[PDB]
Design a protein around this ligand. Structure first.
Ligand SMILES: CC(=O)N[C@@H]1[C@@H](O[C@@H]2O[C@@H](C)[C@@H](O)[C@@H](O)[C@@H]2O)[C@H](O[C@@H]2O[C@H](CO)[C@H](O)[C@H](O[C@]3(C(=O)O)C[C@H](O)[C@@H](NC(C)=O)[C@H]([C@H](O)[C@H](O)CO)O3)[C@H]2O)[C@@H](CO)O[C@H]1O
Ligand SMILES: [Cl-]
Length: 195
């Protein structure tokens, strides 16, 4: 299929680099009525822009023990990443916390091809920013996501109580959702329906 540049950009975004910061200390900083987390003379890390809902869980200024999922976003002024902040595990685990199956269904030649796989969850608090990125990346590399027009392609994260989270794959995840945090242990199963 003969896809437009916004699909290319989505493909480039989601197979770009990402970086997991763990148990890091971040410092609160506002400049021009926007809210950021910064680090240390010594940690030449990407600036994290944060949101209203992040503030409600952060402290006046210094903030140890954070886990950040960083994705470089492209230039303003300087380079930023949106959201992806969570608290470190409190529990101690042998390996992972949860392994819900990720059932991948791909429309094809008058058929559907299904692949089941496990997705290994390490964090008590996992942001939607991270499940969106890693999942779509996986699907780009292993299932040809964004080679054809995605149309209604969706990822669904389904919880134990039945509550779910949907990632419409024809658009980038809206900024304000990158700070939504769900409980890693209560993820029941995961679904993708794609072309
Ligand atoms: C113009 C625009 O983009 N508006 C945004 C909303 O999206 C629009 O409305 C939805 C219903 C769809 O029609 C979109 O195509 C349309 O653009 C946006 O609403 C949210 O959209 C997402 C998908 O983009 C999804 O449908 C959200 O609903 C759920 C979900 O399926 O993920 C419904 C779940 O019950 C709820 N889960 C709970 C409560 O456990 C979740 C959950 O709150 C979120 O997943 C947390 O991120 O949402 C639907 O809300 C809206 C909200 O982000 O923003 C508008 O800008
Ligand atoms: Cl099994």
């Amino acid at each position: 299929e003969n896809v437009t540049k916004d699909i290319f950009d989505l493909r480039d975004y989601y197979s770009g680099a990402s970086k997991e910061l763990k148990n890091v200390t971040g410092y609160r900083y506002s400049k021009g009525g926007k809210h950021y987390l910064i680090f240390d003379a010594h940690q030449a890390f990407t600036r994290i822009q944060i949101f209203g809902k992040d503030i409600e869980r952060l402290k006046a200024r210094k903030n140890p023990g954070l886990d950040i999922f960083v994705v470089k976003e492209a230039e303003n002024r300087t380079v930023f990443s949106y959201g992806g902040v969570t608290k470190k595990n409190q529990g101690a685990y042998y390996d992972y916390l949860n392994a819900p199956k990720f059932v991948i269904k791909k429309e094809v030649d008058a058929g559907v091809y299904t692949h089941v796989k496990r997705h290994y969850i390490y964090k008590e608090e996992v942001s939607l920013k991270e499940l969106d990125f890693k999942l779509r990346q996986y699907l780009i590399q292993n299932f040809d996501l964004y080679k054809k027009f995605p149309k209604d392609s969706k990822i669904k994260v389904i919880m134990k109580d039945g509550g779910y989270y949907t990632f419409e794959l024809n658009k980038k995840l809206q900024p304000h959702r990158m700070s939504d945090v769900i409980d890693g242990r209560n993820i029941e199963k995961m679904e993708a329906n794609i072309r």
